[PDB]
Design a protein around this nucleic acid. Structure first.
Lengths: 417, 200, 40, 50, 417
RNA sequence: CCGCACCUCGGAGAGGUA
């Protein structure tokens, strides 16, 4: 009787089960109260109760096992983790803990954890003895993540243009610079779909912080993966906590030799949240940015790196420019000198309804020879030297007319010769 | 982090009353005095905090001396032997840090020390203004008659003292009498400097 | 083990050994401030 | 000085001339507390024990 | 029993030693705690422990011996230096202290210094009587540091072009002005390799500040020397502290008649860090720079000079221009009128994959007759007069075609006449 | 705690005990 399985069932089936068990009227009771009552009734018979969740250690020492479907929102009905077990098993924030639980006794408000059975969806013996992420030797992007579908679909044109302009690999740290109303949503959805289709082994993560609830419920019902979000109706502390939980889970997965790909579309929103929640230091920089406000997002961005011992962490954030606020401009100018990949989008091309409106001239990738072969690099260099003299709109039209003739870029490369 | 004292040292300061260092010195001296008055047979306890986020720690110190006088605050040279006897006599700072004891009632004497140091800073400002407008013979009223020293009064939160060696050997002063004297230097007396006046 | 063996020697003699620590010396000084032990 | 009360109102730190007037137990008498009652005037906010 | 020797050992050998000694489980423990427990158990027997590190005197009076492997960062295993020991030997920040240490006893948290054995890689008797760096008479560069190796590798072309454009000597103070994506990393690596090969007596120090971790791990595993780095994940205060530690160590080494060379590609980043960590004064100049923000980097830059009594302090830094931020432009314009050597690089030539893309016309060296002979100066003047009429790309092509004819510059100069 | 935004410690009465 897992907690997640009981939380995923609809309210109707829960009310039906509660009426069959013979409890009080559950129609006017909350779903969480129904779950609590049915867990008490099931434990009264003598059966054991099991649960799971990601650990969220508080400042006082203890922590809880939050759920992913609620963006790790603080709730009164979760698995309490005593500091004793934390000191015993050396648990940290982000460790996925699964084990036996029990209903709280009189005077308690949370489910107590007795014994942990599975750590990070793996054996506890392999999770206790491990090399920390701070000790992993970083490296440049070595493996290639080919975003091209190859099925000849019209949606694959965006992935083809992306692979021709900025090849992305495992451990890449890129930036998607674009003005508002450029098409970042559809482009990010296409990137997520291509990652889920071509690279299913990669752990795709979408973190939409401080966005509209309609866009959140659209993203959750469109892509095949995990979508942890935090709308603007929640305070900035919620955003900070969600980002911390996500980066801790990503670090734990990378330590467990997993290829995590994080698509962030709120780096500017996260920086604003950090600048809002930071105490008044007394020194304000140009644009209303605090001195210690850019530390946390810059570290979150730099966390992405390629691991030689195993696994990789790829983070492709999306920047916001020309938003009318000088603070966002200062944030973009500061974060520009940090990454090594910029995917610019042109508003002039977007106004002509030419999607995708990708600035091919200003795009590029540093050390691209480590992700492409010699002949592929030579062909890309020749294509750039031929395209550069033409204008942005003309270059995009030429590229679309050339890619529309065939399905794969290999045929275009063979015909160019 | 102790946000309570941080907000105070950040807000109340910068108004020519707290120079961001004398305020911390007064606060640590007040905490030391509170810890001294807290214990019964344990005197001469100090504390040093010179950081905003960094909290204060109470490290009770002993007086390095080769004798046994004041057995409550005296230590031997064998404790300095760990430093190869580098701790010369006359300087007393070394010991293990102990548990700090903070309380809201300790702010009573802390506020008194703070306002006393603010009055001392205002006295220093009056001294600076006097130096800016010096060059004339002044008159002052004596307050007390101590050994080899007297006092002067100019009611603008100011004060002055005259050394007895510089005065006439026959003339003895009394409170309420006006004294004519030109000041020439201010030596850094303990707990605030004082304007020294000389007649000879 | 007993306090008498430590009180038989002065604090200077006890501080002349690396076996004693800073916390132990502070505790000995706090115990001797009450004039109960470690009085030479 | 009216400036010190402004500082006392700026921070939550207590600062006043505190005199002890607590209710103590007379000499000789003893016992075990079996009941405690608290009556508060209208308008005044109640405390934790009350 | 040395601190650095036990610190350089891998985790496996330390865990094995701890298990053989019969202590608590060392698998779920940090390396520092393992080393601490091993040192405690070894000191309980009665043996002596030794350590080393550069001294860092705090404001309160005490000091710490920071380790080189941690890039001079505050760690739990730092060696506590009491103020009495500083008063006995008149120690200062930067003085390397290699001597007997002891583990922290009951109530202590840092290793204590019992007896100092070596000061600045020399006897303390020679260090107690020394001439300060401020007393050394400054002079122009006299000893020539020929970057050209003479072996004939294709990497030596950059050093040859640098020597023919702007010769560098002991104590030279120059700036490599280059826009982003100009090829500064490869040029700096080539300079470091040439210095290591030709002049192995010159202490090479590659100081990285606010750089990428991939570039850091690439630099560390490529050059043969000491590499002190501080990625952007650290705040500006840590950057300033690392820069101060490095410059103090360099000054203390130069005071011992040593040839120290610092390759810091962070002058603009260091200026930004100083402007960020400086308290607000209410007076902001053009570009968002404080009136006193540039004083510290100006003095750091001007500290480089040639010493006649012995030793030299060479600082070759790379600058950034055309970065889209006017602050960097103001910083470059202020730092241009301070030094006496400017190495400008062209982005137009760099886009054509023509290396080295060095602006030969704008380059030059003040008082270059003290590092080159009369005939060499005449040949350089003739080369300048021949190159000046041609365009930048044309001059680069001419130089490449001329250097491809021979292996060394001497044969080229002999055949030109 | 004064203003957010980068060009060259007492008196009366009632009851009781010896």
């Amino acid at each position: 009787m897992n907690l997640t399985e009981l939380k995923n069932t609809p309210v109707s089936e829960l009310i039906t089960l509660g009426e069959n068990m013979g409890l009080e009227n559950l129609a006017r009771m909350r779903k969480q109260d129904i779950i609590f009552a049915i867990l008490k009734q099931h434990a009264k018979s003598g059966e054991d109760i099991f649960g799971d969740g990601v650990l969220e250690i508080l400042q006082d020492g203890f922590g809880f096992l939050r759920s992913a479907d609620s963006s790790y929102l603080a709730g009164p009905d979760d698995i309490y983790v005593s500091p004793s077990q934390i000191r015993r098993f050396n648990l940290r924030t982000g460790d996925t803990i699964s084990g036996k639980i029990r209903p709280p006794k009189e005077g308690e408000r949370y489910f107590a954890l007795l014994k942990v059975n599975e750590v990070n969806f793996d054996k506890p013996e392999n999770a206790r003895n491990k090399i920390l992420f701070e000790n992993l030797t970083p490296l440049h992007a070595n493996s290639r993540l080919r975003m091209e579908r190859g099925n000849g679909s019209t949606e694959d044109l965006t992935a083809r243009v992306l692979d021709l302009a900025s090849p992305i690999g495992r451990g890449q740290r890129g930036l998607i610079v674009a003005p508002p109303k450029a098409g970042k949503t559809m482009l990010l959805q296409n990137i997520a779909q291509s990652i889920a289709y071509n690279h299913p082994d990669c752990v795709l993560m979408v973190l939409l912080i401080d966005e509209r609830p309609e866009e959140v419920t659209e993203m959750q019902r469109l892509v095949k993966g995990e979508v942890v979000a935090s709308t603007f109706d929640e305070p900035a502390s919620r955003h900070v906590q969600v980002a911390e939980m996500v980066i801790e889970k990503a670090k734990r997965l990378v330590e467990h030799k997993k290829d995590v790909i994080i698509l962030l579309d709120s780096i500017t929103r996260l920086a604003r949240a950090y600048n809002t929640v930071v105490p008044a230091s007394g020194k304000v920089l140009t644009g209303g940015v605090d001195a210690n406000a850019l530390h946390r997002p810059k570290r979150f961005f730099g966390a992405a790196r390629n691991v030689e011992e195993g696994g990789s962490l790829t983070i492709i954030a999306t920047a916001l420019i020309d938003t009318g606020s000088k603070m966002d401009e200062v944030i973009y100018e500061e974060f520009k000198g940090t990454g090594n990949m910029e995917l610019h989008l042109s508003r002039k091309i977007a106004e002509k309804r030419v999607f995708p409106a990708i600035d091919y001239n200003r795009s590029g990738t540093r050390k691209e020879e480590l992700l492409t072969t010699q002949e592929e690099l030579q062909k890309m260099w020749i294509l750039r030297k031929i395209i550069h003299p033409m204008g942005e709109i003309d270059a995009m039209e030429f590229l679309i007319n050339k890619l529309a003739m065939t399905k794969t870029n290999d045929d275009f490369f063979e015909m160019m010769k | 982090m102790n946000k309570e004292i941080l907000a105070v040292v950040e807000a109340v300061s910068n108004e020519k009353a707290l120079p961001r260092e004398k305020i911390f010195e007064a606060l640590e001296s007040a905490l030391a005095t509170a810890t001294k008055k807290k214990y019964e047979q344990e005197i001469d306890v100090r504390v040093q905090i010179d950081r905003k986020s960094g909290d204060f720690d109470t490290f009770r110190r002993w007086l390095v001396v080769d004798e046994v006088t004041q057995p409550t605050k005296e230590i031997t040279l064998e404790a300095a032997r760990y430093e190869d006897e580098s701790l010369n006599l006359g300087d007393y700072v070394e010991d293990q840090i102990e548990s700090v004891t903070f309380d809201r009632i300790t702010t009573q004497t802390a506020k008194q020390v703070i306002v006393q140091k603010v009055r001392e800073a205002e006295r220093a400002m009056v001294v600076d203004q006097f130096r800016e407008h010096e060059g004339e013979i002044i008159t002052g009223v004596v307050k007390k008659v101590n050994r080899d020293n007297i006092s002067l009064d100019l009611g603008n939160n100011a004060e002055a003292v005259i050394l007895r060696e510089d005065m006439l050997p026959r003339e003895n002063f009394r409170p309420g009498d006006r004294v004519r004297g030109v000041l020439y230097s201010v030596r850094p007396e303990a707990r605030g400097a004082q304007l020294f006046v000389t007649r000879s | 083990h007993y306090i008498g063996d430590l009180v038989q020697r002065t604090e200077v003699e006890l501080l002349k050994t690396p076996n004693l620590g800073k916390k132990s010396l502070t505790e000995i000084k706090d115990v001797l401030a009450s004039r109960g032990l470690s009085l030479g | 000085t009216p400036e010190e009360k402004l500082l006392r109102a700026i921070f939550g730190e207590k600062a006043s001339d505190v005199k002890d007037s607590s209710l103590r137990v007379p000499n000789g008498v003893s016992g075990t507390v079996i009941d405690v009652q608290v009556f508060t005037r209208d308008g005044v906010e109640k405390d934790k024990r009350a």
